[PDB]
DNA sequence: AGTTAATGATGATAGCGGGAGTTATTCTAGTCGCAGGCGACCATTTTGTTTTGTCATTCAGTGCTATACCTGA
């Protein structure tokens, strides 16, 4: 039980919630959190930034998309979250170090 | 001289309703030559869709100060 139950929810709200960005404004209000509620969490159950878990969340939710056969590309980082394509890109590009194509024709 | 009764013919009408099935069957008639337009195939340029490179506006975590409930003097 750290801060009442807060591991629970956030993995619900994680799999629940749609592309909508995760910050800590759209976070904390309807996740019966302060930023402090959410800060211990990450430094000690995850230990790792924001910016780069839901990064990799997003990347790794996208790897069966790209492997479902989909033709509409700039659809796929939009419907998990990346906003424009070219944020999507440099975060793959600086992750697996490979082209969107040479994944997707995998 | 010119006017009323009378003759063969084309001209033309003769029912509302629904009921069905695959589709019926050929008149006998040649070939040889040259020349223009088009169906079809493919290459190329224009445009839409995709990936990549080069400049600023922003949000995590580290650490301290501030407030409330629990156990204690």
Redesign the pocket.
């Known amino acids: 039980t750290i801060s009442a139950q807060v591991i629970d929810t956030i993995v619900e709200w994680i799999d629940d919630n749609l592309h909508q ?4 404004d759209d ?1 904390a209000r309807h996740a019966g959190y302060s930023k ?1 509620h ?2 211990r969490l ?2 000690q159950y ?6 780069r878990y ?1 990064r990799e969340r997003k990347l790794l939710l996208a790897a069966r998309d790209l492997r479902d056969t989909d ?4 659809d796929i980082c939009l419907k998990y979250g990346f906003d424009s ?2 944020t999507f ?1 440099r975060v793959f ?1 600086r992750t697996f170090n490979q ?3 040479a994944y ?1 024709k995998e």
């Open positions: 960005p995760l910050r800590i976070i402090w959410l800060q990450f430094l995850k230990g790792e930034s924001l910016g839901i033709q509409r590309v700039y394509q070219q890109t590009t082209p969107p194509g997707r």
